[PDB]
């Protein structure tokens, strides 16, 4: 695979040196869109672009999306500081799109977990937009010690039983220190027309976070990319699970 | 007894302060968990806890479950607002369990009317799930005045005779404005294995609302807490009554 | 949302202009066909079409099916008059199908009240076909004043108390003046093959009017779209409700 | 994380330099047991040993067992050649044991996929010992071109539709070129005595391969280590899965 | 017709050589898959394939399904042995499907006795699953001689009168030595939707063995192939017969 | 495997020597207790104990329960005689429980024939208690010769054709000489709560003898161990079999 601190620097180069098939730089100018009056919090990275410039890195994102994204997101944090003297901007998302292979929803499940994939389908329903605790800061009300606990949006709220410093159980969730974002679930499946006659269509549930919330309605034809997650479904004599797609990038199909 | 305002205070306290013998802030943690992405709509409260922390209040929810349960629900809403800055959060139920006495169905008398009881028995039947109007919003077709009327699932629907404001006798219940929850009847009785030979087992009908509907099938042995109600027999106009159990909490025995 | 006058415009547009990916003017062609010697009394509209052409309007018929369906039917009548010089043509239904979400019977909650839903399931029962008064014409025996009163098949008959004009309390429903259509109840439920072991299948009653009556027998598996209604349980005066599905479109699954 | 070619060399050092808390080398002599009249095909590596000598590597095995093992197995292949002039020995397994944390069976499922874990429980049943195609060699009967396809024991036999060289569909599985091993499933759960009164015990199914087949009978109390795998269970409207434990090392509890 | 030895040759060929219009070696691939860790115990053979590759043989399995089916099973066993060096592999069934003609239950006559037919209909009933002795091993209590006797699930058990070797009339069936498979009866009939008004639907009983037992529930519409049997009515000693369908292959219609 | 003489030795050992993790001589203590004024007629043996002490023997009682159970019962009789000088003591059963695998009723196949299995399920039915002849003493009316014939409760009564000694064909079963024990049938099945939706629960009939008769009523959930038997369906002369569970040990789940 590839060293983590190295991907960071390898992405910075992509972000800078790249220019498309007409000889025009592009990611320099996407980064500037982060500093308008109404900024964005996301940088859409074409993967065909990243592969034609750095094939060995592009195949590492897919193989390890969790690290691959986290890396590219540090490389954006840097380039904003080195090429634009900014360290005030805060969290920026790196959303990859236009991957090599496009799955139909039915083809997922056969697919492997924790790997970046691309799916095309139709949205059948979307949830209530609700606040998600993405970072929980617990506080000992006895000694004062703070404890940070990061959260996965596909697992319930994880907490801490006792204070790691003084051993006290008298802890509370500090809502102010903690970090919240928007959350919105949705469900896609394969469009009836792309299936055979007596073929039951299949579905998968997704998670949208922060700034890609409220991006879609039912009936929308879409192309999402994200990471599959295995989630508990029922704790039977032996547990069964399902697969949900934590979305990294979504756009409508044209 | 205790007035509402004060019960709510006493409850909000219990929730925040109570700790078990190990020092876990049980009810703080449960309320904390309502901030999870897919929360419960109930908070179960061990009566023995409430009793050890505020015995007068604990004995008060048995005597006046309707008040106590309501107070405890308002307390929860307060803690969510005050200690977690959560507002939009919906109704959260306070369900009490583990009362000091467990009755057999044959022991449930009309003296227990409108108090909280705890019964053990086996489910004989379970009704079909239907919607029930917890909150009926009526609307005048003339002035468009909106009158809110709460209902009880064991009493008949309470309509309005005439508009309270414009005086019009032309009001209907507005379905879109009103609030509904799931409803499901069920029946428990004493198992024959617990009775004298020859003894006819006694039963009682209950009601399950909202998030405890469809929690039991026939053949299940359960422990329920609930407010006993005695309602006039609809069957006739005679002075014979019918015991109904409005369930507050239900769990299966041995789990 | 959209006011009636404007929906009708937006609909008439859709009908005339919409074309599929191949360029066929689907709804023009269907309306054209109403000029055949033995026409249909309905025009089925693929929701996904309406959505791709006028998404705001499409999401509007789900939110307010009663309005949307009514608007679309007025639009059809317009196109027949304007583009085909056809007047006498009777009522033509607008039946929407292929909604984005398909519910199981067990998922149909009272939150869906008065919205359009799409359900899949198996027909358990089918009622006897009877006449229903879509339009009740009442007539005063004194002045001969005629009062028109529309009805809903899931509500009780709305009569008139007294003559609106001469004030007489002597009016009867005139059968010859009134309009009737076929009516037929039916029931669908989830197939056990789709539930957890031990799970009791849930069901729901529906209503078929006019030209979709007698379209299904028991055993059929179907997909219906319809406006969910929640009506007070006639069984009693209690606050318990009953879900009824007023079917807008029905087709068998897989065909 | 760590570079792959590097773990190899890092393991070779462990295998050589290590000596226990009494000052005696150990893995030098385990490797010689591979060259007796009746050799072994496995080297049991204590993890407490690997952690006390190379903490950063030991935590990488657990985090990436698939690579971590494959690495340590190359490092054994080497050390047999460099310190014992042998490249004839063939496939040797690296089986890690005595990990930091021991799960009860019930605690699995909550556990993460593709990570080395350790479980204690009791065997309730064991399967028929049967031959598993671990490496499938397909052959084009037209041009002659060979195609190698490696197999996962928790997924059905994977094949190839057509010849990658000449495009022909006239392919056959060459049983002689292909590689087979023993396979035997089994099932463990938590011992009734370590559970509460009205507590339904939970189970998990395991896979034993090659030389660790037939190692256990029902009733045996055991400590296995392995990698969890998510497997399809039923292709419902949305697919459900289960978790099975591909075993890396098994021994009875004393 | 064809003798057994030669059918097996012709079948082994078909399996190995057959390719579809795209060039896929269908039956090679299916047999290849029996080497997977959890294999099937059947190989389904499209009759239309066999027909296009060896028409005389194909028409032979309809005329003599018992022979053909047996030959095809021996062929499979050969290919596994010869081309995959697999021996221990158990019995593998050859199940034929997609025959040229599909009968309605009302068309199945006794002329079809002992031939292969293909029927479409709806499952009315499904029996309880029971064990059936495919291979009865008898054992003499005196000499310990072992006599193997195959059985048919539609005929009565064929015992042995006396030991074939030591002549002893003291033999019993040995259960441990014998082979059993699952058995399950079922019944199909024509759907009334396919008959004249007033017509009484006709039915027929079938048998499912081994790995096709418990494949259908009532209400399922299916297409089955099977050997028709006509057995004397056990009901009496009269000369009236009963049609039974010994199913070779079953799949649901429309899938 | 192990011959009878040697199993008995190995068993007698286990009984005497076995100790748990705390050092209690469990089976010594149980056998000691048979000297109490009102003893049991059974000694329950935890399989996991026998397995930890003599694994080969333990796996042997599963493979050959009839032998193993019989051997263990002879061992008990020995220990009572040798270590307690007790002779007159009647038959004492050896009932094994807590086997390594627990089957669902649907998993019990004829491969388990004549082995020991452990099943979990719910009692659907319980038969009437009747007497069964464990030991049939037949008596010749001419010479007065006595022939002992043991019986199995799942097979038909084995009589004697003619007197073994005087050759007379005139023998009857002597009731006073014979031994009887209580007999009771029962039936268990899988609970629907444990099956796929739509799945028909499977069941199995069992037999309780002597001191475990009348131990369960319908509705009880139980864990049984027993020797599976497959007996020919008496219903007919067909080759279809019937699974019957000859219960060795039964206890209710969770207690
Ligand atoms: Zn602290
Ligand atoms: Zn008013
Ligand atoms: Zn008038
Ligand atoms: Zn080739
Ligand atoms: Zn003989
Ligand atoms: Zn005699």
Numbering used by the authors:
A (entry chain H), D (entry chain H): 0 to 253
B (entry chain D), C (entry chain C), E (entry chain D), F (entry chain C): 0 to 254
Paper text:
MCM proteins have three conserved domains: an N-terminal domain (MCMN) that mediates the head-to-head interaction of the initial double-hexamer; a conserved AAA+ ATPase domain; and a short helix-turn-helix domain at the C-terminus. Crystal structures of the N-terminal domains of Methanobacterium thermautotrophicus (MtMCMN), Sulfolobus solfataricus (SsoMCMN) and Pyrococcus furiosis (PfMCMN) show a consistent hexameric ring structure with three subdomains: a helical subdomain-A, a Zn-binding subdomain-B and an OB-fold subdomain-C. The crystal structure of PfMCMN bound to single-stranded DNA (ssDNA) revealed that subdomain-C binds ssDNA in the plane of the hexameric ring via conserved residues defined as the MCM single-stranded DNA-binding motif (MSSB).
In particular, the carbonyl of P238 is notably shifted in PfMCMN-βT when compared to PfMCMN-WT. This shift is not compatible with retaining the specific P238-V132 interaction in a hexamer because the constituent atoms are separated by 4 Å when PfMCMN-βT monomers are superimposed on each subunit of the wild-type hexamer (data not shown). AUC sedimentation velocity and equilibrium experiments show that PfMCMN-βT most likely adopts a pentameric structure in solution. Analysis with an A5 ↔ 5A model (where A5 is pentamer and A is monomer) indicates that the protein concentration where 50% is pentameric and 50% is monomeric (Kd1–5 = 8 μM) is 7-fold lower than that of the PfMCMN-WT hexamer (Kd1–6 = 60 μM).
